[PDB]
Amino acid sequence: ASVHGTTYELLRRQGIDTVFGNPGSNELPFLKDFPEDFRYILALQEACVVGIADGYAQASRKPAFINLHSAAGTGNAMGALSNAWNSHSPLIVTAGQQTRAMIGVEALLTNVDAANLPRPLVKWSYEPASAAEVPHAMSRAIHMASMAPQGPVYLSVPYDDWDKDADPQSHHLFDRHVSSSVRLNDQDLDILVKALNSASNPAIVLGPDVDAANANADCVMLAERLKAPVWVAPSAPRCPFPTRHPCFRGLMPAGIAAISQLLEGHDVVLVIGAPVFRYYQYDPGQYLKPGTRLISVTCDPLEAARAPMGDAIVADIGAMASALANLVEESSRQLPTAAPEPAKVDQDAGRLHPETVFDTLNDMAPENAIYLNESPSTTAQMWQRLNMRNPGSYYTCAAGGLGFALPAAIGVQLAEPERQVIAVIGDGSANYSISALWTAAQYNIPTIFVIMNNGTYGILRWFAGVLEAENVPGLDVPGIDFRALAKGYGVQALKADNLEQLKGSLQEALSAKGPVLIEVSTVSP
Amino acid sequence: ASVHGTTYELLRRQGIDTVFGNPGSNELPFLKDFPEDFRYILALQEACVVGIADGYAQASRKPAFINLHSAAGTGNAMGALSNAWNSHSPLIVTAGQQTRAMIGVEALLTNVDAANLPRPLVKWSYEPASAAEVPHAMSRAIHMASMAPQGPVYLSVPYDDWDKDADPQSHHLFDRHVSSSVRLNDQDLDILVKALNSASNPAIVLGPDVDAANANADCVMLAERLKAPVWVAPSAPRCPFPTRHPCFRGLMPAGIAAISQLLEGHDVVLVIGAPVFRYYQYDPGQYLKPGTRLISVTCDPLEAARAPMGDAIVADIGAMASALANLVEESSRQLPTAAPEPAKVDQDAGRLHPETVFDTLNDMAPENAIYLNESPSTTAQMWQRLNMRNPGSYYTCAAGGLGFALPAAIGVQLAEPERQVIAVIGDGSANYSISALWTAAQYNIPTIFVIMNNGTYGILRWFAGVLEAENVPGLDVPGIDFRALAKGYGVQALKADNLEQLKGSLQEALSAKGPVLIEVSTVSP
Amino acid sequence: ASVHGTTYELLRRQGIDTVFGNPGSNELPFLKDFPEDFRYILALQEACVVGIADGYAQASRKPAFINLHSAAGTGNAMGALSNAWNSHSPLIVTAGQQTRAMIGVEALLTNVDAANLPRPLVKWSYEPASAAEVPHAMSRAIHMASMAPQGPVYLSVPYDDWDKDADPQSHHLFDRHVSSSVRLNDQDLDILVKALNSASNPAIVLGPDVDAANANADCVMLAERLKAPVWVAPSAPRCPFPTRHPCFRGLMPAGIAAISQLLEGHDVVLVIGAPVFRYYQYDPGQYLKPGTRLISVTCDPLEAARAPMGDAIVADIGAMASALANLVEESSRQLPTAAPEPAKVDQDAGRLHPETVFDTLNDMAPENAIYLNESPSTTAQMWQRLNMRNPGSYYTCAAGGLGFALPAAIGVQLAEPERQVIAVIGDGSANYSISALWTAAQYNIPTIFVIMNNGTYGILRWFAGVLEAENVPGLDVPGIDFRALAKGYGVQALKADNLEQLKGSLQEALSAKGPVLIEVSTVSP
């Protein structure tokens, strides 16, 4: 067998059947004779390729496979890799290298010092020392991406390797099963359970790894048993809990003092599947107030090490959430009462308040919709106004890197063909990966893109006003016609300049058989 | 003085007056109180920011300053940095970091292990250990970018550093002059000159560092004195010689055997300002035939070390070209005869042959036009058909990374406001940095963009046919309306479906007062 | 509180009370006011410092703390770090950096790009961005070293940080508990147990992480229940099983074909706490024969990913070994019969055969002795001839790096003051870290060093004979007087030129109240 044949057999035996790519010449020998049982999803720029694969991996809860072109292709994807690192997305990034005979002379398209290029944003990065090692290196990439804590990996392959003979002993790679589905030993788990049972006023904080593990329902049972309020850890990349459940208390503010104040009076705070914590703004104060102790369950040693407070347990979130939910006592305390519904903001017949947009989406979207967010000045509103009952219903860029939601919404919609995906994206953010629209058109992936057009990088204007920073350049983005951009890439386009038009456009989009972009004129901040 | 004030004084004293950027929150304290004497050029995605700055630096022959947002902003620019590395572009890339107080906890937008992120594509990469060190670190970045061999550098700055007090001894940085304008010692230069004077059939090969040094005219004098044919080294990022001078012989094929065959019978081959060599295709054979010896003058130790043949001298290209041109004897051999003009390809009233497009550009463009190329299947034709008399008249992506020419053409046009820039970009390539169009619209930088629309990644289809590679996916890019994309970003748009319309559209574009995109329907390969 | 006071409080609260070091000027501000409750163990060269700390950590089963001087001190320790990486040794390596005010100018003793220096041999490497971050960074170092898979970490600290004010919120670091004591979820553990219970001819292979976890006794119970033979995985850094237990089958040969042949006919092979596998010699063949399947339990994702065959489970070795030993059925198969005692090699009244030396050590040493090995040509003999009943009874360099056993034997003896440590070290190996002897003298740590003097790098001579490699230089090491070297560093020295003198010297050494070196004249290979 050839290295090409052996590698595609390994991929299919490990459950991979789709290649997200933007091709180049070092990849032609890999892509030739492309197997009939695989699909290839083309995107026009590499941030788009990796963003689509990332949404696909996060929603499917399995690894996604990417093929990029040498150093420049890899480099164009590195902002996307920053997000994938922070979301623990299991991405297998492959890039083609020059033929081994011309690496030394640094021929055009040689990826120099290749394994160092994506660092520090990957768990593992490697170029094999011979062609026959390629299947084994690919096996290592598959398992490194997939083991907890999941994350992106990188493999560089010289283009001449694919046609070489494989090692016949590579067959032992095909069916390897590798598990990290582990939980705390019985004695120490009993100690933890006793501490939870004994708490007088416990609180629960959940992060994205809960949704990645599909541990949401177990966390619902855990919060019901403990009769405990549930927050979402700050800078949330996913939604880990039904947002209208009586225990839900919303997204935590991303500040040290704000969080310790919120948790004041809670004697035990159990954090599951989050860093402790992904603060953002500078809000100095106490990490916890007196009387509060924190216990973190995380799948990631790097999270456990860097927490500035609390105890930690490094284990699988699915296994731990299931065990805790089934072991704790039913508390006799009263179940928390549900948060009140948000107020209706006054809306005239002009430009839309973000609050109006979210209320209208919530009124009109299916109960199993999936939302993406890259409208950063409106995040708090979005979290208050969308009822998200089910797992896998929210994604936003985990490292703050713009250009995620537009392509990721296409990959999520590919992963969940029966759940309507609705991406809510600011006018500034929409440009970073605008070419991803073409992929939705070409493959008829029926994502709805809602562009919040206020003409500015609104959150930066806000922060600048806060800092009392005068004379900051570069904060306005006038003069972009998003309906023309959508036309450019083959996506049906609608405009909503007021509420009547928003409702009409959403009705049209929801009925449509293909992707739709709605440009919404929103109020300037 | 503050670190902010001291750093902008250092920049202005070192000749920097423009910031190419896409802003974020870690950069607001740098950008606040932006000095009245500086300009800020916004682009909507970081590959575009760096591509614009790169064209500006290459055409201006001085360093360009870039400000990006943390890890994701830096990562989105890394494909652009791959090209800048191979073109020796003097780019000072700065990125904002989180406040020092929250780096440890890895708050959102912390750039982790920051200096390793852009490696291996930068000459120097650093994050200072204290706020007062920031001006000195910026000084190091300026000189590292600017010293031969020029190249990109990276500096990460925590956002809280800018408001801190500067060291008063930082004033010694402001007026430092650092020179690398050096040439081979007299004794060994005399040996070199004697070898050139004695050669019976010398040849000259020129690379991009000749154009970067503005050594073109000296190389003309050198070739006239030696009566020697002149080629351009393969995979040429710039044009180093007038393309209708009698000595000019065109772009070398990027193959080992092809080059040794071309040079056969030339006893001494003098290479100036190029790697030896930037081969691309696999074309195995002899590096040089018997009877040919090679001597390379390069500004880059890494080029001298990796050449597989020949002697080398590491020195400044401007200083060496000037000295050689003024020291060699006038040979009594006959001056080489000019290459014949290219043939006119038969053209019907339908889709345009690339040859027709280039002949028409050459007929209609000013004699001081500047061209950019990211239409890779038509490069050989372009080089044969455009008379480029002057320095600084051609740019193409030096590492093969697409998404360079569109933004770089805007930076070149900003650098050379009296020279009409015309970028010839394939339909595939145009998408990578499509959002850069907005910058040309907003600042009214009157670049002309000629999109060669053949519906496919034509060069890859060609290579696949060569490899006899069947069933390669992802090679076609149907369904893109480039006039709509241009409308989307505010750029006037024209279409040319035949020669009559091409001529008309070019006449309109050349007269226009702003940027113009022409979508040309070209023949499918 | 100062950063100095806060950091020593964090260390003591996390159980650290000893600093292994070789001091320099960047470390004086850390070492000043050294706390009365801490000890400092000086060694004269940094490979010795880290080797002593490594033996101490491995035997104590807890992290050891090291303080080295800047880049040169760190660099001198990097071979020692290679071994620590492969043995999963929890080492906290700190190095002093220049004052922040002179880092920029690269004053003498600046550690440039410090965090990159020990890569790739550390789990985590870091330099803090401010003085107040130092305690948090130290907390991260402690937990990164200590979490499974354990390993070395590196922290660089500018010398001016220690006297600065600490953050009062650093107190939340002091009592953090972080656990990785996890095991496979119940459902999948039941599947594993059923597979073991059902096997017709199971085999067990144990590696060093079993001994690190003190899982030895549980593995004895597991092998007794399954009635299964037990091997030690190749290139063994520790002994994980009593070597005269009836199930014990010895050290596996470090070859692909040799191992698959050994395992032929075993239907299920359970590997615990080892890489799969640490092969050494090139011995190509099948990874496993038909009919054999392999299941690996490892604490290290990097081991699970790179195994070329078998399934894997990433979990804590102590927790998994305990659970398996207590869950499996008692098999009705007959218990394996003990290996026969090794033969007595003929010995004349001249130079000693290695076999004689090991038999005499086994006759004379206490039953709770601890052995170290850096006599590589005699390893197989050593493993056959020493009855090691207890855990923690054997150490050898896990990455093959010489200079480990001499200093490590001093740290093991410091960790286990009531167990006589006996290091058996070749004449070649003894030189690498010869200065470590001084530490044993100064602190009166009563390690016994047995130098096997055959005048040559015997294993290399052997391999060269195998390769039929003629004319290899540098394989002989004549002319070293080890009794004089021991005198040089204050250690009592004895010589044994024959068996009578070996017995006498061992009797004297075993009674001695301090360290003793015995130079043994062994037969030339």
Ligand SMILES: Cc1ncc(Cn2c(C)c(CCOP(=O)(O)OP(=O)(O)O)sc2=O)c(N)n1
């Ligand atoms: C790749 C990248 N570049 C720049 C930024 C900085 N950035 C930028 C430019 C923002 C503006 C978002 O503008 P928008 O129009 O999408 O939304 P709002 O108007 O709601 O702020 S928010 C932010 O952090 C970033 N996060 N990521």
Ligand SMILES: Cc1ncc(Cn2c(C)c(CCOP(=O)(O)OP(=O)(O)O)sc2=O)c(N)n1
């Ligand atoms: C950043 C990046 N991604 C992918 C490629 C691979 N690539 C690709 C996709 C090419 C197709 C260019 O298509 P085009 O339409 O611009 O021009 P032609 O039709 O003349 O080939 S040429 C080439 O090397 C690349 N060079 N750089």
Ligand SMILES: Cc1ncc(Cn2c(C)c(CCOP(=O)(O)OP(=O)(O)O)sc2=O)c(N)n1
């Ligand atoms: C730090 C280092 N340098 C060199 C070697 C190479 N090496 C060397 C030099 C060996 C010779 C050991 O000689 P010895 O006298 O200690 O023992 P033998 O005579 O039993 O081989 S075994 C081996 O792999 C090494 N393993 N580690």
Ligand SMILES: [Ca+2]
């Ligand atoms: Ca409603």
Ligand SMILES: [Ca+2]
């Ligand atoms: Ca906006």
Ligand SMILES: [Ca+2]
């Ligand atoms: Ca003409």
Ligand SMILES: [Ca+2]
């Ligand atoms: Ca094309």
Ligand SMILES: [Ca+2]
């Ligand atoms: Ca005996």
Ligand SMILES: [Ca+2]
């Ligand atoms: Ca020896």
Ligand SMILES: [Cl-]
């Ligand atoms: Cl257990």
Ligand SMILES: [Cl-]
């Ligand atoms: Cl001179």
Ligand SMILES: [Cl-]
């Ligand atoms: Cl379980």
Ligand code: NA
């Ligand atoms: Na009202």
Ligand code: NA
């Ligand atoms: Na990198």
Ligand code: NA
């Ligand atoms: Na014709």
Ligand code: NA
């Ligand atoms: Na005998």
